[PDB]
RNA sequence: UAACUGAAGAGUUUGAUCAUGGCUCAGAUUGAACGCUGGCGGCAGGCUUAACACAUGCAAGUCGAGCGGGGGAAGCGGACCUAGCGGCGGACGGGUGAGUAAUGCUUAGGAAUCUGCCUAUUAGUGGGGGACAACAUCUCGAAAGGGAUGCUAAUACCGCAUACGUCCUACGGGAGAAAGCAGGGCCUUGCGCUAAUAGAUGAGCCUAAGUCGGAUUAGCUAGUUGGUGGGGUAAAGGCCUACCAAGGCGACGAUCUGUAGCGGGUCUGAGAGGAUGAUCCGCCACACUGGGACUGAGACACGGCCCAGACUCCUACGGGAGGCAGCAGUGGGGAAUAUUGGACAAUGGGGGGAACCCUGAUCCAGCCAUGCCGCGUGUGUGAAGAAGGCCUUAUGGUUGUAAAGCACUUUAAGCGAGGAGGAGGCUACUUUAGUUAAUACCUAGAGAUAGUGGACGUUACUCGCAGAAUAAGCACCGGCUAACUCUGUGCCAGCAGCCGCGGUAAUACAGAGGGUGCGAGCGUUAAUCGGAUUUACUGGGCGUAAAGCGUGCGUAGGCGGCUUAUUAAGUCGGAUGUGAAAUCCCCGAGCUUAACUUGGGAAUUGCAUUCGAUACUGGUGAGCUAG
């Protein structure tokens, strides 16, 4: 009972903190051929483990700062 | 406070109520948390004059809910 | 509000019989201008009568017959057009199940603008109430019967004659004895006549 | 103003407010005994300056002046400043 | 059993034709307005413009069974009233849409929170102090309102004691409450008060994805993005702060600018869409303009406080008052929108032990054809085809069974009589549980006798009475488009949605006779969708009608050969929760019918969670050679 996404690191510059790139496949409403829509979120670190170009889960928390309310939960395919 | 208590909404002279669970700070005929019943006092021919939905009742009766002094008395014309 | 006028005109303009003016030496050979247009160019020459005026003449020429203004005609066929039978004979069900028309029907009063004037003045006991609406639709096994408070006036007793000689339909079990009908269930479209045509109608109210 | 209750709710918030800030003021004084002895360095000293505001900051939130949940926050904070003096 | 049923075209470019392409028309709808006309009832609806300024009344009180003082009637005691202290209410209910383009709203989910009254369960309520109003004397002021000084109760305030459980803890210990009142016989119930838990309810906070234009707006940010220590909150958090680091958002439109409350829904359409967000329900925001905080369980408070602005008002010039976007109402603006009404009888809300008090919520009534629905303004006969009018071949034709005359009827309006329902209850008088010394008191339940309680209200409805008596208009008649003639006028006067009529036979102007359509209404203007496949997803085009960039090359992007293994994101299936009610639709029940109200369903095919299927598309690995 705990949402996860999944995601490709795009930035790792901040201390105790990456910011993920999800990405999503939706049909149009009036033209139904397809997209690809993306959505950067802030997640937080804890030992700095992910690195820019990585694949991570993430899950929902409490909030952790102004803009921050996702925690990492595992580093996938490490690449 | 929850209560319980008629919602009166019919036409002009001729009144229909629902029987409502609701806070007691809302509008009369506003917002409410469930319907259990209704009540006609007009009530003609084959057209029923009362039912109460009674477990519902008892339910809440004992979560708190105030019955009104109307609809206190319908739940004990009803199951009579 | 209703048509009070000239009754045998509107009969020209249609060219058939309408029933109104009921009597016993009508033959529709009460007016001598009949089957000639009203007016001054009544039937002057031909007519072009180009496919609206076809459909709006029957439409006009069943709603003589039957004394229904245009607002309520256009309720009915709504109503018939939502019926899940077909648009068509839901009409003329309906037309048929009024008061008035079954009330003349079962012989008392002539005309139907007579029948009209018989329940509008609370005389008749529909299920052993006098209503004085003259359209309420009357349901399978309603006892229409007069009011014993008016049996006497002798309106009744020449309509109960030209009553007679004419009809007495399959689906009103009248007696004129106690003055009391029995509605049956409502006729279908083989008791009333085939000249009236409601297929032009239904796409009249389309256009 | 325009009633009589209306005006006799104004005139008792003045009283009220009146006594409440005493009060307040009551409680931020002793916090602030406690912390210029926590500055102080002396361990003995502050647990004496602590020994003497808890009673205060307590009776004070058991008559409303203050919420329980922000007495026991400043409990914890103050003792989690005195024990890590020795 | 039903809850589905669905789609029409016409006129106009030419001497004629086919195409293209615009313009116009026939439909549905409205919170409408105007013009001509106007009898009734039932249901609704009624400032869309100036979030413009507001005279007058009313819209929030209640408790003497918390507490002193008082007062007047009545027979020194009973009853009764209330300015002040104190409790609770005043944060609901009612209005409005200015701001707000996302700190809002909708859909689906979460933590880190508080919550008066209400229900349940546990441990209590011990003993003391010092004040202040009222009051009694001074006292400034025209008034409003203060000012001095003494005197006082309390469920007002503050110590002390004791705490099942509650708070902090370094697990050793430490900390912290409260109040009485009433009815019957110190003992009994009630009503309260304290501490705690968890339920109800109600509120605060977080996340993701949706929510109107503009690039003739491309860079924006410096508590800005992150971290550590401290502060702060009911509670997570740059919410605040000091340091450290430097980041964060943006062509998937940031920043800037314009407009806008949002949804359930409403109108239209065969659908797909398109317009819209009055009346009813939910959420948000605001209260003369801007900035604050107080009290409280809750407010940054419509009829509360402070201080800034404007603006109005009184004045004795000393000094003060105020906020209709609450209901009525006034002025103003406008094309345009109602009474300075009744009752708390019913449903709710506040206070009270109750009696009962308050309630412009509400229930009702007045005004208005504003809409929807229903009824009436008579019914038969009646050929001397009367007269009159209009046309005319002068004889006829039409108005026309139409009218008279004769025979009837009396719905609704009117005048008299009867008369439900909306009121369940309460008070007395008996009797049985109930806890308790107790058959007192006090909570419950059974019974017939009475008493009392409706604003609407001359109610609905029923039954009588008199007499056709009291009751028909508006648009049109060249084509489109149902329906034609005469006279007047002579490109004039005029008409007109489009084509177009009118210059001496005008079916097109004006009147008249006849006709057509609707009918207590009928026409015009305005606006939305349709017709319009005329922005085309469903569902169009680009040689010559409007339309292929002058030509390459290339970035983002879109799309991409064949075989195989795997994955399971798109795709497909099932299950579970959700999708408020009302509304739409379908059965069927009350209104004499109908509008209308209402029972049950169906629908809300969207969203999320989970379990599966792998053909196709994507990802990954391994191969091939037709590009
Ligand atoms: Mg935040
Ligand atoms: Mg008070
Ligand atoms: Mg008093
Ligand atoms: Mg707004
Ligand atoms: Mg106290
Ligand atoms: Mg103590
Ligand atoms: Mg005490
Ligand atoms: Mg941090
Ligand atoms: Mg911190
Ligand atoms: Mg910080
Ligand atoms: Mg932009
Ligand atoms: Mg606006
Ligand atoms: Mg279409
Ligand atoms: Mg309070
Ligand atoms: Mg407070
Ligand atoms: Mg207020
Ligand atoms: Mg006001
Ligand atoms: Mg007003
Ligand atoms: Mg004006
Ligand atoms: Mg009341
Ligand atoms: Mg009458
Ligand atoms: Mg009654
Ligand atoms: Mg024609
Ligand atoms: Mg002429
Ligand atoms: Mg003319
Ligand atoms: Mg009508
Ligand atoms: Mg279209
Ligand atoms: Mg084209
Ligand atoms: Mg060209
Ligand atoms: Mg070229
Ligand atoms: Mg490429
Ligand atoms: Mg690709
Ligand atoms: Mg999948
Ligand atoms: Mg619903
Ligand atoms: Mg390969």
């Given at each position: 009972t705990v949402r996860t996404l999944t995601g490709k690191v795009?930035?790792?510059?901040?201390?105790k903190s990456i910011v993920v790139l999800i990405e999503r496949r939706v049909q149009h409403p009036l033209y139904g051929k397809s997209i690809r829509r993306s959505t950067k979120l802030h997640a937080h670190d804890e030992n700095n483990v992910a690195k820019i170009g990585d694949v991570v889960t993430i899950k929902e928390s409490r909030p952790?700062?102004?803009?921050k309310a996702w925690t990492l939960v595992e580093v996938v395919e490490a690449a | 406070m929850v209560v319980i208590r008629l919602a009166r909404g019919g036409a002009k002279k001729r009144p229909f109520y629902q029987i409502v669970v609701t806070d007691?700070?809302?509008?009369?005929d506003g917002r409410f948390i469930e319907r259990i019943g209704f009540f006609n006092?007009?009530?003609?021919?084959?057209?029923?004059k009362l039912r109460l939905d009674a477990d519902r009742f008892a339910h809440w009766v004992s979560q708190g809910a105030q019955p009104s002094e109307r609809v206190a008395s319908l739940a004990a014309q009803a199951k009579k | 509000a209703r048509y009070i006028g000239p009754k045998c005109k509107l009969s020209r303009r249609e060219?058939?019989?309408?029933?109104?003016?009921?009597?016993?030496?009508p033959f529709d050979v009460?007016?001598?201008?009949?089957n000639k247009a009203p007016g001054?160019?009544?039937?002057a020459r031909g007519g072009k009568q180009s496919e609206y005026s076809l459909q709006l003449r029957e439409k006009q020429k069943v709603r003589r017959i039957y004394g229904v203004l245009e607002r309520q005609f256009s309720n009915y066929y709504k109503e018939a057009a939502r019926?899940?039978?077909?648009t068509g004979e839901n009409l003329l069900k309906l037309l048929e199940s009024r008061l008035d028309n079954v009330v003349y029907r079962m012989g008392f009063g002539s005309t139907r603008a007579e029948a009209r004037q018989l329940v509008s003045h609370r005389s008749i006991t529909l299920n052993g109430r006098r209503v004085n609406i003259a359209s309420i639709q009357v349901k399978a096994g309603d006892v229409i019967a007069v009011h014993?408070?008016?049996?006497?006036?002798?309106?009744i007793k020449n309509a109960i004659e030209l009553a007679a000689q004419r009809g007495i339909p399959a689906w009103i079990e009248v007696?004129?004895?106690?003055?009391?009908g029995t509605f049956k269930a409502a006729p279908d479209?083989?008791?009333?006549?085939?000249?009236?045509?409601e297929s032009l109608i239904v796409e009249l109210y389309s256009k | 103003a325009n009633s009589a209750q209306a005006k006799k709710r104004a005139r008792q918030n003045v009283k009220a407010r009146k006594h409440n800030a005493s009060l307040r003021s009551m409680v931020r004084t002793y916090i602030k005994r406690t912390l210029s002895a926590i500055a102080g360095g002396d361990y003995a000293v502050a647990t004496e300056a602590y020994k003497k505001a808890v009673p205060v900051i307590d009776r004070m939130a058991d008559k409303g002046i203050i919420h329980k949940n922000k007495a026991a926050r400043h409990k914890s904070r103050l003792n989690a400043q005195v024990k890590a003096l020795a």
């Open positions: 795009v930035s790792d510059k901040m201390d952790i700062s102004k803009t | 007691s700070r809302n509008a009369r006092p007009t009530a003609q021919g084959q057209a029923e | 060219g058939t019989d309408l029933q109104l003016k009921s009597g016993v030496k009460k007016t001598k201008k009949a001054q160019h009544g039937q019926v899940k039978g077909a014993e408070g008016a049996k006497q006036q002798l309106r007696d004129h004895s106690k003055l009391e479209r083989s008791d009333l006549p085939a000249e009236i045509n | -």
